[PDB]
Amino acid sequence: YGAIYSVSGPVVIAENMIGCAMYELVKVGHDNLVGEVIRIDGDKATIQVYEETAGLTVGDPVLRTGKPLSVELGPGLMETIYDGIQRPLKAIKEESQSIYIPRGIDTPALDRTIKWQFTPGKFQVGDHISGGDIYGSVFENSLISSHKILLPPRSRGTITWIAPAGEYTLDEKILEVEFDGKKSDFTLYHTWPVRVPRPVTEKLSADYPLLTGQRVLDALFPCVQGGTTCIPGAFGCGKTVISQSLSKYSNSDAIIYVGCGERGNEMAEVLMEFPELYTEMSGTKEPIMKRTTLVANTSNMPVAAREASIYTGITLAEYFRDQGKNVSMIADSSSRWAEALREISGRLGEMPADQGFPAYLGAKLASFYERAGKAVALGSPDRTGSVSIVAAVSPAGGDFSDPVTTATLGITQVFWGLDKKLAQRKHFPSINTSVSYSKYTNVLNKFYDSNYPEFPVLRDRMKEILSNAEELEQVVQLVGKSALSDSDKITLDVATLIKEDFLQQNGYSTYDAFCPIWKTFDMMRAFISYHDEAQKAVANGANWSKLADSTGDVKHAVSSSKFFEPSRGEKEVHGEFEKLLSTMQERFAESTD
């Protein structure tokens, strides 16, 4: 079709190129470099090539594709590792044995050769169908038992031919529907313009907690599945525990890890960890890689790939939401994606408007985070899903003032706020409870009052005593410890116990690797009851030191309460916690005398 008329760095101006919509991916050159039409004028379109244009020549054919940047959704997408624009980074290494990514490589985003078992749904021939209707389930892998395929949201009509149960590759023309007499065939996979969200019937209000498994996160600073999240992605803060606990323990039925322009060795570390992370439930031996896809990008990936990394991640997440799976992205270092946006804007000449970032950085971030939210999938049957974006921010110099981090803090409801100092003291998970706010605490009352009624007031009490101790450490610095009242000393001792044995979670031992919500609630009750009994028996009784020395066994019991095995059973653990509380009450009654 059209021929190249001009090349200047990455931009490439085609000619006689009538019929190419804006933002339409066009294969450039004889090597089929992938570029997107960034500007069309008359019959010539300024193509913005992704790969290096070191070899392009005037007259090289540029062939349209008729699709904007589109991820390739379907089975076989569960386990693989992708770059920014969904090039499978394993198939590229396997078919082109070289360590490098060849220019203009075009391995299909989903494995064509694998034969998927397919069982058709309730939709018979002649049944009217709509976008998003589940017309069959495919056994992808043992951890995604039914990858329910579904008609593309922008297709509708009468089913004219449905494939019977059998093993099919992704090119097998599974279903053929008719609309306005124009037959259209559908395969096991469908593509979707990445920059427009997959539609939903109704986008509900996310009100079910995303149990990360970390005690401090689920207790004090909760995030709701379907809700967003922000994380300081600076080195050494302890981002590893957050990412691995989200992808390893949380109730999310899928994970879309997306790394934008992360340092090459960081992505090497992530791609070597994730294959060797295992899930204790849903079987015993299934690795999490059986349910998570990684959109990996070293910093030298083409700038457009880094700029579209979070978009492809969110479109894969929306796909796994439309099947009813509470998928949860973990977007690592969104600040690198903002850097990619800055480069695209500057190279395009778009005028910078805030510290060099383009004008639409705020709008793009707001939209991308708005693609979160528990939502009712399109079509029928009407299963609901939810996408959660836990997106880390790692500003240029740790400034935490550049517009990307300000926008993310403004938009993301919960900001778990890791800290370097808490990590140097080896206080994992290194959550800085002073700043780590969470605006999902309110919408979660509908869940708490259902089955953990005392949780909200309990965490309010724990947070207020923790803040009181943080304030009173300044008073201890100013004047000697003895100047504190008995109640103040109680607060300091109880909050030290908190910081040492409730927030501080080993995470590596078998007893507290996964702190379930019921165990966290029972520990919260134990700790708050300890503070309350000490406070009461001192306000109406003897000096704090005498009780503390007299009831040191009770404090040891509540401290060792962290060791109760979650595998012991919810009923057994709750009964044990009730036994601990009863022995507590009787021991404080005894020492009150």
Binding site: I81, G264, A268, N300, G356
Partner: protein, 475 residues
């Protein structure tokens, strides 16, 4: 079999006498037959001088050739520009180790052209992120301040941030002379089983320093492992952009197509950024932040991220991209971006250099993010990590207590702080302070570190684990 027989075909080169316009470092052709975008040309001057140029932009039948070595003398009538058919590509071979190359790939020494094994393209290709593997073992640099407690792992890409006039440009020579695996130091087996090499790359070095590099690598034994890519300050700036790509392509060859490791050095990447500004403004692009092009980060990453170990291939490229602090501020775009792409930073500090220390490494801000991989029982001694931690802690104590000596007087300092002043003096003057030509094996440097930490009683060494103290403190 070797499929390199395709090189026997001869491709005649067109020779255009149609240089219609000349503008700055550019010349503009017309009536060109399919001008490839990036394409080296042998632009001939009226007198007969050959002056290489690189095609910078094409439009229909017009190619804006950018000319190296200035533009003066290029007329519109007599000059004839000849298109070589392919972009610039270095001729590589396993036996360039020992050749001091010019900025543009031509050997600048008295040796002949390299009997090329291959003609590797310059820009190469990005390394498959799935094909990377994590840095594992130490790559000893002989510098006590860097080897022990700013350690570098095979595959790490850690810079040496440096002030304008600091001797960083001599620390580069010291590292390139003394770099090497710790396997020969281990002495438990053949350490030369897997060879080591270096590909130095000086960019923007003034001749008084390029000659110093050439002399100091020839005179010492480091040349038979080094591919010194020198380009001068007054050498064409486009060659200054080319040189880091040249060195990284050579490093990728030596480290992946052969198997030997390599510790590539990129001297003064600030000058490379300066040259990249000239390229950006040549294309009439508007300046981004600070005058550097907005895509500064992209063309820095496409250099740094060409390093790291690889699954399958045994080799590994270790970068130490040295760069000069423009005005001694991290906030400058170049140090900021490099620290945003690299795995840490190793400061060279003006304050220590004014005291006469060498090297003037400032340990307190310098850190290696993935140092903990290159430290342990297998590589270096088992006490290396805790020795590093304790040295850093006691150095911080010494610095703040040296600050307080002028505030609360010397006699009012706790005995910990008095011992910390003594330790800081001995530290800065014997451990950090290293002779310019003194190669300190990492085991030997750890021995000095222990001879320095045994100032303190075993109880005051809280940072070190007791199981290590109980066997290393006394010896």
């Amino acid at each position: 079999k070797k499929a390199v027989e395709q090189g026997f075909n001869v491709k005649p080169r067109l020779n255009y006498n149609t240089v219609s316009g000349v503008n700055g470092p550019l010349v503009i052709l017309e009536k060109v037959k399919f001008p490839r975008y990036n394409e080296i040309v042998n632009l001939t001057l009226p007198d007969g001088t050959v002056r290489q140029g690189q095609v910078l932009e094409i439009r229909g039948d017009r190619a804006i050739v950018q000319v190296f070595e200035g533009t003066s003398g290029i007329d519109v009538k007599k000059t004839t520009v000849e298109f070589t058919g392919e972009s610039l590509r270095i001729p590589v071979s396993e036996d360039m180790l020992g050749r001091i190359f010019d900025g543009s790939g031509r050997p600048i020494d008295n040796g002949p052209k390299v009997f090329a094994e291959d003609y590797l393209d310059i820009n190469g290709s990005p390394i498959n992120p799935y094909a990377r593997i994590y840095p594992e073992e130490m790559i000893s640099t002989g510098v006590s301040a860097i080897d022990t407690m700013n350690s570098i792992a095979r595959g790490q890409k850690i810079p040496i941030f440096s002030a304008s006039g600091l001797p960083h440009n001599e620390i580069a020579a010291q590292i390139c002379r003394q770099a090497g695996l710790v396997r020969p130091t281990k002495d438990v087996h053949d350490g030369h089983e897997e060879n080591f090499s270096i590909v130095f790359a000086a960019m923007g070095v003034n001749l008084e320093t390029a000659r110093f590099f050439k002399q100091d690598f020839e005179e010492n034994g480091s040349l038979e492992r080094t591919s010194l890519f020198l380009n001068l300050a007054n050498d064409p700036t486009i060659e200054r952009i080319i040189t880091p790509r040249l060195a990284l392509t050579t490093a990728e060859y030596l480290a992946y197509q052969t198997e030997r490791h390599v510790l590539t050095i990129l001297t003064d990447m600030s000058s490379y950024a300066d040259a990249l500004r000239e390229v950006s403004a040549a294309r009439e692009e508007v300046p981004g932040r600070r005058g550097y092009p907005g895509y500064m980060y992209t063309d820095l990453s496409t250099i740094y991220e060409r390093a790291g170990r690889v699954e399958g291939r045994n080799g590994s490229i270790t970068q130490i991209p040295i760069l000069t602090m423009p005005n001694d501020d991290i906030t400058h775009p170049i140090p900021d971006l490099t620290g945003y792409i690299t795995e840490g930073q190793i400061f060279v500090d003006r304050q220590l250099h004014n005291k006469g220390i060498y090297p003037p490494i400032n340990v307190l801000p310098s850190l290696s993010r993935l140092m903990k991989s290159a430290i342990g029982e297998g590589m270096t001694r088992k006490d290396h990590g805790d020795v590093s931690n304790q040295l850093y802690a006691k150095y911080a104590i010494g610095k703040d207590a040296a600050a307080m000596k002028a505030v609360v007087g010397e006699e009012a300092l706790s005995i910990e702080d008095k011992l910390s002043l003594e330790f800081l003096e001995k530290f800065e003057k014997t451990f950090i302070t290293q002779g310019a030509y003194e190669d300190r094996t990492v085991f030997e440097s750890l021995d000095q570190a222990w001879s320095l930490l045994r100032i303190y009683p075993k109880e005051m060494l809280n940072r070190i684990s007791p199981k290590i103290l109980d066997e290393f403190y006394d010896r």
